[PDB]
Design a protein around this nucleic acid. Structure first.
Ligand code: FES
Lengths: 142, 76, 80, 156, 128
RNA sequence: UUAACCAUUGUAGGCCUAAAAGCAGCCACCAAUAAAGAAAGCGUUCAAGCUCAACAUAAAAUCAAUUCCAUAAUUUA
């Protein structure tokens, strides 16, 4: 069973959100964090990362990870930790063209996240759509 | 981290914020291919904006077709 | 089912029933369910051979058989 | 028509009955209209009914027959009336494994719209203007040609 | 009654997408899809890129009309059912063959070398 | 349109929410893929995960005719 989580690499044992949820299906929690910790060393600590762990009936771990979230990074780029109540029209940060594009190039490196598209228009829409989800307006230039 | 608008717009501070990746400077706009800055920066392509003969037109129209059924499904 | 063998000739006239039934046999979920089965696909009238350890050999031809019967026949056979 | 012979099983497509050539009413989209039988058959015409019925009395699918829904309901109703009337001795139900008839007397019936099993008795007939009506025939067969001076009385 | 009476392209773009790819690729190796996921199909496309082949696919219900409005009208037997389309413009028989080796369970119907109906075994024999 | 099958990835997207990821609230409402609803009923410590919609569509079935109290009956113009 594929379980999707966004836990930050810095904390390999968040507790309730991962420990018991995976344990309910029946797994070794300590084993999960160690393999997750292996990703943590390779990746920057303290940044949310999407995971694609598969919990098989055999009580084995198949941990698959990708590039860190653009959504939280956009929040960090906009200097926003906690956004506005709605964020549909509330905006606290503006992102120009260049910042939008540097990150899109980096994004096009992982198998997951459908980052094999030849056109970069695929990448912009996700981050633009992600920005719309956040309390951020992607203005052309400020 | 960077806290200068000039450095923000003249140096790639957001491209990498890891420890192994050091903030790299921005090359000139001409130093990158034209398609990099020609990507769609406007709002999501609407049925009018989408070309009737574009795959996104039908795919988004298919998404719209799901929306109407979903609206019906929610009421049930 | 220890082994499942499906044979059909695309170059000659190929019956749809066997091919449609073949896709179900060559399915990731189906293969996992009957993990014991060894999936072998023969491509060159069509003949499908299914072998059981108990000695029951079940061979299916789709020329005059609908896919529904083939799936039903195997499904009961697999349960044993 | 495919028949399965049976472990290894073999299915052979066998000869299927062919419609007689020269339909009386060519240009008929539905087989019943092709033969000008739209409103001139009844449950008593078992010969026609048997063609559309399973060997044990089950209904054949409309798609295979290809006839229109209006006749399908009429034909299905006619077969039900004939079956309930014991007019289809060769299409009697298949006994599950080795069962035998209940051996109780079977009442002779015809023009039976509904199963006799599921019809409750009518204790109170009613007075002059409260008389209860007895259903005879089926509404599906209303359009059938009538040779009487006045339209047939469905309610008896 | 109407049933008794005497007898009395929406998808349009998807032509262009399929028309472009097939016209480019003379021989199409046809293998039935094993209920594969979208992400895997992209991965297999890169796997074919190792083989210099492309998994360019679209709803197969429009694949049957492709022959109706395209360069050829006689490849319908090739595209029978829901199947992965291996479209190759070069006669690299070995590259096509090892595509089959990548997934044993998945069946390869064959390759229409020069847009001529053929089987997998025939494809290899003729391609040789 | 709706009868039969199938269901990937971005992103657990931001929001007081411990956490709410389509599915507590709350947002605006896009992308990739052949085909995916920033979600429709389910499931909800929260999610995974069930289906409905995605791609495929099957194949069905504009209203009727205190104690009963003649007996009955659908076709000869
Ligand atoms: S008799 Fe013509 S529609 Fe059936």
């Amino acid at each position: 069973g594929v379980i999707r989580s966004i836990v930050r690499a810095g904390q390999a044992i968040p507790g309730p959100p991962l420990g018991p949820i995976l344990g309910q299906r029946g797994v070794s929690i300590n084993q999960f964090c160690k393999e997750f910790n292996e990703k943590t060393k390779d990746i920057k600590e303290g940044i949310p990362l999407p995971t694609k762990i598969f919990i098989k009936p055999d009580r084995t771990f198949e941990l698959k990870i990708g590039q860190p979230t653009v959504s939280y990074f956009l929040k960090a780029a906009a200097g926003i930790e906690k956004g506005a109540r709605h964020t549909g029209k509330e905006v606290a940060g503006l992102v120009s063209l260049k910042h939008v594009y540097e990150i899109a190039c980096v994004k096009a490196k992982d198998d997951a996240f459908a980052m094999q598209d030849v056109p970069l228009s695929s990448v912009v829409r996700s981050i633009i759509g992600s920005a719309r989800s956040l309390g951020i307006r992607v203005v052309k230039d400020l | 981290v960077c806290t200068d608008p000039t450095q923000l717009t003249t140096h790639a501070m957001g491209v990498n914020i890891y420890k192994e990746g050091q903030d790299v400077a921005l090359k000139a706009d001409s130093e990158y291919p034209t398609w990099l800055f020609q990507v769609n920066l406007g709002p999501p392509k609407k049925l009018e904006e989408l070309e009737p003969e574009s795959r996104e037109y039908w795919r988004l129209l298919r998404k719209q077709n799901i929306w109407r059924h979903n609206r019906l499904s929610k009421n049930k | 089912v220890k082994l499942v063998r499906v044979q059909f000739c695309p170059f000659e006239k190929n019956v749809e029933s066997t091919r449609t039934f073949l896709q179900t046999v060559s399915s990731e979920k189906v293969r996992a369910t009957n993990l014991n089965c060894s999936v072998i696909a023969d491509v060159r009238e069509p003949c499908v051979d299914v072998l059981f350890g108990d000695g029951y050999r079940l061979i299916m031809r789709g020329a005059h058989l609908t896919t529904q019967e083939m799936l039903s026949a195997l499904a009961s056979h697999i349960r044993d | 028509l495919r028949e399965v012979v049976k472990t290894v099983i073999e299915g052979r497509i066998t000869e299927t009955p062919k419609a007689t050539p020269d339909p009386p009413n060519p240009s008929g989209q539905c087989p019943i209209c092709r033969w000008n039988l739209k409103h001139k058959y009844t449950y008593e015409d078992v010969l026609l009914l048997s063609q559309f019925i399973r060997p044990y009395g089950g209904m054949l699918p409309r798609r295979v027959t290809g006839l229109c829904r209006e006749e399908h309901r009429k034909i299905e109703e006619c077969v039900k009336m004939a079956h309930r009337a014991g007019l289809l001795p060769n299409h009697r139900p298949q006994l599950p494994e080795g069962c035998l008839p209940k051996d109780k007397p079977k009442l002779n019936r015809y023009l039976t719209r509904w199963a006799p099993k599921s019809v409750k008795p009518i204790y109170k007939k009613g007075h002059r203007w409260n008389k209860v009506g007895m259903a005879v025939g089926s509404p599906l067969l209303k359009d059938n040609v009538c040779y009487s001076r006045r339209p047939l009385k469905m309610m008896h | 009654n109407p049933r008794c009476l005497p007898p009395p392209e929406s998808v349009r773009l998807l032509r262009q997408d399929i028309v472009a790819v097939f016209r480019d690729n003379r021989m199409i190796a046809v293998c039935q899809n094993v209920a594969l996921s979208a992400e895997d199909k992209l991965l297999l496309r890169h796997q074919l890129r190792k083989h210099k082949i492309f998994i360019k696919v679209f709803p197969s219900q429009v694949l049957k009309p492709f022959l109706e409005n395209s360069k050829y009208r006689n490849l319908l037997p090739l595209f029978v059912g829901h199947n992965l389309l291996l479209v190759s413009e070069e006669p690299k028989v070995k590259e096509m063959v090892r595509v089959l080796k990548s997934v044993p369970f998945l069946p390869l119907l064959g390759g229409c070398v020069d847009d001529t109906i053929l089987s997998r075994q025939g494809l290899v024999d003729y391609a040789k």
